[PDB]
Design a binder for this molecule. Sequence first.
Ligand SMILES: [Cl-]
Ligand SMILES: [Zn+2]
Ligand SMILES: [Zn+2]
Lengths: 49, 49, 396
Amino acid sequence: QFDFRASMHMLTSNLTFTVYSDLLAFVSADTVEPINAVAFDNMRIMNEL
Amino acid sequence: NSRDAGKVVDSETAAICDAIFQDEETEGVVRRFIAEMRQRVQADRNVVN
Amino acid sequence: MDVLYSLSKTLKDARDKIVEGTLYSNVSDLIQQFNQMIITMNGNEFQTGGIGNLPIRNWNFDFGLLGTTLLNLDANYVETARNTIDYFVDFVDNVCMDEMVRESQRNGIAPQSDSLRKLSGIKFKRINFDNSSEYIENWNLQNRRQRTGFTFHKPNIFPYSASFTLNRSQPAHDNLMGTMWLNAGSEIQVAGFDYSCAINAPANIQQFEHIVQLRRVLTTATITLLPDAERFSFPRVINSADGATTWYFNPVILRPNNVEVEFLLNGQIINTYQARFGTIIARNFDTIRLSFQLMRPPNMTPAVAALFPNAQPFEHHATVGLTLRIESAVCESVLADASKTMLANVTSVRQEYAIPVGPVFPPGMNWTDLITNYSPSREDNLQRVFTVASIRSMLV
Ligand SMILES: [Cl-]
Ligand SMILES: [Zn+2]
Ligand SMILES: [Zn+2]
């Protein structure tokens, strides 16, 4: 049998939010000039110039 | 049937509530509750019930 | 005071009516009043001060309202309401305690504590709702200069006094005529003693009078009058008036003669009771005059005649008595009584925090000293603290 007391509930959620997928789109990524690019040892990748 | 600008989720709940409200065998207390039951939107907290 | 009482009453109603399984319609108006109280108190900072050993406490109010969401209240709703109610009840109890421990000579009826002074602002007047208790009702009526009274069972109207008056006395204290009396709370036990049993009296009649001036006017008083004073009917060794020596009392009880109890107001005979014992009614009075006669029995059996000789030494001393008990009364002023706990509550709060003696009340809230010198300023302060105590008793 249908019982109103047993069927009435309060559903709770958030009012609104925006879900994002591409996190890296929020990053402005630039690079140094290749002439000035350095390796792990802080020296230029290519030194013969 | 809300007397205080009430809202419910979802449209099926609205249909059920209207059917119970119009039913003659429904309790008066249940009818008054349907007429008075309210949602609670807390925008500051970003919550909706 | 009305806002503090309204906070206490709202919290009491919330604690009593917001219960698991109760219909939403049993609390709708209560929920509205409670949410109004929450809205009014939210965003306000209160401080209960550090008078005596009472700790300084800070109170912040940021509470969400109570919803109206279930047809029958559940455990979650009651838990949230209980959290809010517990915090509010602690705040109200501390405010009541802070107000109870202060006093003022000039404006004794006005709020004294900072918290209650703040609650007297206009912004908090919205919290005010039903004022049905006897003390809050009397407070509101008195603020409007309306006639109102407190009903007391066994009112504590007589300051403690166990003393005697000797109308005939000698250094040897062997032929004494006088009166003893205990005036304690609602009781007046008086006795008149003649050592000679009125042998030399003008008509073998000795007249005794006891006048008790009540510190406040009592109305609609029911009183019990009994012929004998049991407290002054056994042998005693009594210190002299100066305390230099002690005299001996050996009572023999005779029927009081021509008993007249007069209840007077403004010197007018309001009520008169002649030879009437049992339950009597005094309409409205401020003085009691008990006049009673010791009559030497004209006819005595040989033992009775042996008790009272025609001259000294007198071994048995003829005593007549009277017991008066104000069982209940109505007084326009607050008083201690046997059924209420206001004096006890205020005294306990003041003692448990070592409140220094103020400029109004006696040390330790001694009731005998308070009632003995029941000044208008003391009356105002006592009414204030008693109303606060009655407010506190609804929650604590
Ligand atoms: Cl009693
Ligand atoms: Zn009693
Ligand atoms: Zn003496």
